[PDB]
Amino acid sequence: GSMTEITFKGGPIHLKGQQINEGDFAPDFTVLDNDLNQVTLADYAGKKKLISVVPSIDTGVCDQQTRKFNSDASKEEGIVLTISADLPFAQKRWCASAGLDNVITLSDHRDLSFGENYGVVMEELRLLARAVFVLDADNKVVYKEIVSEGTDFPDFDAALAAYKNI
Amino acid sequence: TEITFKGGPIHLKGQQINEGDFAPDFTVLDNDLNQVTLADYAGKKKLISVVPSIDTGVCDQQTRKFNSDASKEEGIVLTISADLPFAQKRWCASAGLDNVITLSDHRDLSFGENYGVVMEELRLLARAVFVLDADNKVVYKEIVSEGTDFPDFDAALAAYKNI
Amino acid sequence: TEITFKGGPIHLKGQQINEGDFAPDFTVLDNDLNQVTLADYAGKKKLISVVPSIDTGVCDQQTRKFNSDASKEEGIVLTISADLPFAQKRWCASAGLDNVITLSDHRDLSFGENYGVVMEELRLLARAVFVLDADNKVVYKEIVSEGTDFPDFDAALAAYKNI
Amino acid sequence: TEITFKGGPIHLKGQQINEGDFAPDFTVLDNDLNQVTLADYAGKKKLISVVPSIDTGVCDQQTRKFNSDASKEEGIVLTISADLPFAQKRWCASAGLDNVITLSDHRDLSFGENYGVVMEELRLLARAVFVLDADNKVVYKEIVSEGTDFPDFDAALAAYKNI
């Protein structure tokens, strides 16, 4: 948009953090796994990544996005990461109810390290903006979408195509 | 202001509030993201149950027990945590309850900072209980020593009933 | 044996190495402070990328490009600088890349002095690239004329691919 | 003359300085590679915190603690290490610290040699603290016996505040 880059439920929202564009290298980040272990970029060294960023896996749109990317992306080939400001406890409980023990869900709630490094903090809400970044094994950002209106879905096919084409 | 969580040292951040003080105002969010403050419950006694996260077993049970055992004809039972509003909402729906107030301090830590229960290292609220009379005077306080232990239910429920 | 750095003249110190020479041995530190020498990579061709400091932007990009673009199936890509082992360890963690060897010449300048690439006024290594064959014959050399400029990536990568 | 680092013997090199002595001069580098000397801090008391490398955990914590605990309206807190200035500069930026002085001794070991805190086997500076008054008298010194241990923060802070 003209004042802020995106909206959430139609309300203008300011994105905070470093801007990252296609062609840039991936910044580092420090996030928490479902058991509170620190996880950083280097833990996925040597792999291509599809990073699906969601406002809250406890909402319907985010839930479906996590499911579809995990189902549609080849996990034999690279790594699908879901990152949000949900507490690790909500992510853990979501994976258990879904009966999905193959799905990686990481929490940026404590420092917003991921959000500030990738330019996807929704500042008025302290949630991460709906977004998708595809990284190759050299951590080149080959694809980025920040969804314009955060209650809409991301373009799934374009991100899957970018991940597959690596 | 020195507790442990899982035996690790945790520093508590924010204003110290003791028994006999008047309780400060704060702004948190309801399950639909509306702002709610202390003043929204003016004129009522409160049992304020603070938990690290209702998605854990100890916090879940503490929440259910205070809400089941405490009279709500007589006063208000608030549960405040740094869980996102969406998790507290799903949690009420899973429990099958329309009678439990859950409020989220995740955005600003307004409540945690005003009551001195921010666990700085974790960005979670410390397990605790404050009982406020209808004048917002703090008549009872407990900050649990080890944050993965239960608070003293009986003493807190007594302080609330006895107002 | 003279270059410029940000346009200022700099004197290179150490033994001059030319194409057609056999590369001298040297002792440097790995990210855990174990000693490493050139003999530790015996039998393989090498691209040795030399940078003033991987904590600057040009050195960071040079380091990423040689590591992604050179094949690591039948050769080795070494990055050598006067950065402390701790900065190179942090640097490789920050970037998150797989299989990137960085080695520190901070203690002795054993590599810098053996290859003629010590910027004497600064005690940093000059931006340079040496490509060695599997018998350690030097088949390509560039010491970048202005140290803040990029090296010629394609020339260095073509010499390495040709072995 | 002798300390341990991770339990192995380390020899200290340089001039021995004791409490009561006046402070030797030095030339070290700030984050932009400007030369800094004792004279740049004339008129002030100084807490000089010396660390093996701000890229390791204990040194990072030592640096933050001295900086937040010592009054900076009253005197100067210096951190000196053999890290390249580019690593010090990166460390301040990534930690978000506007107001922390880090100085690099990597080029000459000017500071290390003049203050007797060079760890000879490592070309790193020994973990140490010197406190100087405005006359540059050294009123307090500790060289930590095992270099992975923290200094005595309180004893250094008291000596600094007592000037």
Quick count: other Cβ atoms within 10 Å of Cβ C154?
Answer: 9
Query: Cα distance from A8 to chain B (closest Cα, Å)?
Result: 13
Least CB-CB distance to C55: which of D82, D90, D108?
D90
Least CB-CB distance to D86: which of C56, C86, C89?
C56
Distance in angstroms (rounded) separating the CA atoms of residues C141 and C130: 5
Query: Cα distance from A149 to chain C (closest Cα, Å)?
Result: 31
State whether D53 and C123 contact (CB < 8 Å).
Answer: no
Identify the bridge partners of residue A48 per DSSP, sorted by sequence position. none
Tokens of B54: 């209702």
Least CB-CB distance to A139: which of C93, C96, C99?
C96
List C-alpha distances in Å: B57 to A93, A132, B54, B70, B153: 11, 33, 7, 20, 16
Q: Angle between the B85-95 and A88-98 helix axes, to the nearest 10 degrees?
A: 40
Quick count: other Cβ atoms within 10 Å of Cβ D7?
Answer: 7
Residue partners of D66: CB distance under 8 A and separation at least 6? D47, D49, D77, D79, D129, D153, D156, D157
Give yes or no for a contact between B103 and B78, defined as CB atoms under 8 angstroms apart.
Answer: yes
Provide the 3-class DSSP secondary structure of residue B11: strand
List C-alpha distances in Å: B124 to A88, A128, B110, B140, D150: 11, 18, 12, 22, 29
Interface residue C139 vs chain D (CB under 8 A): no
* Contact between chain C and chain B (3 or more Cβ pairs less than 8 Å apart): no
Least CB-CB distance to B83: which of A59, A90, A92?
A90
Supply the DSSP string of C34-56, one letter for each residue.
-EEEGGGGTTSEEEEEE-S-TTS
State whether C53 and D83 contact (CB < 8 Å).
Answer: no
Least Cα distance to C32 among C140, C97, C104 occurs for C104
CA atoms within 13 A on the CB side of C153: 14
Residue partners of D109: CB distance under 8 A and separation at least 6? D14, D82, D118, D123
Tokens of C63: 């380091």
Identify the bridge partners of residue D5 per DSSP, sorted by sequence position. D8
Distance in angstroms (rounded) separating the CA atoms of residues C163 and B1: 66
Interface residue D105 vs chain C (CB under 8 A): no
Residues of A in Cβ contact (< 8 Å) with B55: 87, 89-90, 92-93
List C-alpha distances in Å: C145 to C8, C52, C121, C152: 11, 13, 16, 11
Helices of type H across B35-75: 57-69
Tokens of A165: 């084409």
Provide the 3-class DSSP secondary structure of residue C84: coil
Provide the 3-class DSSP secondary structure of residue D67: helix
List C-alpha distances in Å: A85 to A32, A56, A113, B84: 10, 7, 10, 8
Give yes or no for a contact between C42 and C72, defined as CB atoms under 8 angstroms apart.
Answer: no
Least Cα distance to A105 among A36, A25, A156, A22 occurs for A36
Query: Cα distance from C91 to chain A (closest Cα, Å)?
Result: 10
Provide the 3-class DSSP secondary structure of residue B134: coil
Helices of type H across chain D: 57-69, 85-95, 110-115, 153-162
Residues of C in Cβ contact (< 8 Å) with D87: 53, 55, 83-84, 86-87, 90
State whether D87 and C56 contact (CB < 8 Å).
Answer: no
Distance in angstroms (rounded) separating the CA atoms of residues B72 and D85: 63
Most distant CA pair in chain C, distance: 40
Query: Cα distance from C53 to chain D (closest Cα, Å)?
Result: 7
E strands, chain B, are 2-5, 8-13, 27-29, 35-37, 46-50, 76-81, 101-104, 118-119, 124-125, 128-132, 138-143
Interface residue C68 vs chain A (CB under 8 A): yes
Distance in angstroms (rounded) separating the CA atoms of residues C123 and C126: 9
Residue partners of D114: CB distance under 8 A and separation at least 6? D14, D15, D17, D24, D25, D26
Least CB-CB distance to C55: which of D56, D87, D124?
D87
Among C65, C97, C102, most A C-beta atoms within 10 A, so best to mutate, is C97
Give yes or no for a contact between A163 and A140, defined as CB atoms under 8 angstroms apart.
Answer: no
State whether B84 and A110 contact (CB < 8 Å).
Answer: no
Distance in angstroms (rounded) separating the CA atoms of residues B69 and B65: 6
Identify the bridge partners of residue C103 per DSSP, sorted by sequence position. C80
Distance in angstroms (rounded) separating the CA atoms of residues B142 and B130: 7
Give yes or no for a contact between B100 and B63, defined as CB atoms under 8 angstroms apart.
Answer: yes
Burial C127-151 (b: 16+ CB within 10 A, else e): bbbbbbbeebebbbbbbbeebeeeb
Residues of C in Cβ contact (< 8 Å) with D31: none
Handedness of CA D15, D20, D26, D30 (dihedral sign): positive
Supply φ then ψ for residue D124, to 5 degrees. Answer: -125, 160
Query: Cα distance from D87 to chain C (closest Cα, Å)?
Result: 6
Provide the 3-class DSSP secondary structure of residue B88: helix
State whether B82 and A87 contact (CB < 8 Å).
Answer: yes
Distance in angstroms (rounded) separating the CA atoms of residues B122 and C19: 57
Tokens of D22: 């006046």
Residues of A in Cβ contact (< 8 Å) with C96: 26, 28, 40-45, 139
State whether A58 and B123 contact (CB < 8 Å).
Answer: no
Interface residue B133 vs chain A (CB under 8 A): no
CA A132 to chain CA centroid, nearest Å: 6
State whether C122 and D107 contact (CB < 8 Å).
Answer: yes
Domains observed in chain B: 1-163 (3.40.30.10)
A41: amino acid identity, one letter: L
Question: Which residue in chain C is spatially nearest to D108 when comparing CA positions?
Answer: C123
Tokens of B12: 């508590």
List C-alpha distances in Å: C42 to B49, C28, C115, D11: 66, 15, 18, 34
Question: Which residue in chain A is spatially nearest to B60 when comparing CA positions?
Answer: A89
User: Looking at A20, A26, A61, A62, which residue is catalytic?
Assistant: A62
Distance in angstroms (rounded) separating the CA atoms of residues C70 and C68: 6
State whether A42 and C67 contact (CB < 8 Å).
Answer: no
Q: Which long-range contacts (CB under 8 A, 24 or more apart) does C3-7 make?
A: C3/C119, C3/C126, C3/C143, C3/C144, C3/C145, C3/C146, C3/C147, C4/C145, C4/C146, C4/C147, C5/C52, C5/C119, C5/C122, C5/C146, C5/C147, C5/C148, C6/C147, C6/C148, C7/C146
Interface residue A143 vs chain C (CB under 8 A): no
Tokens of D136: 């540059």
Interface residue C4 vs chain D (CB under 8 A): no
Helix (H) or strand (E) holding C92: helix C85-95
Residue C92 annotated among the catalytic residues of the structure = no
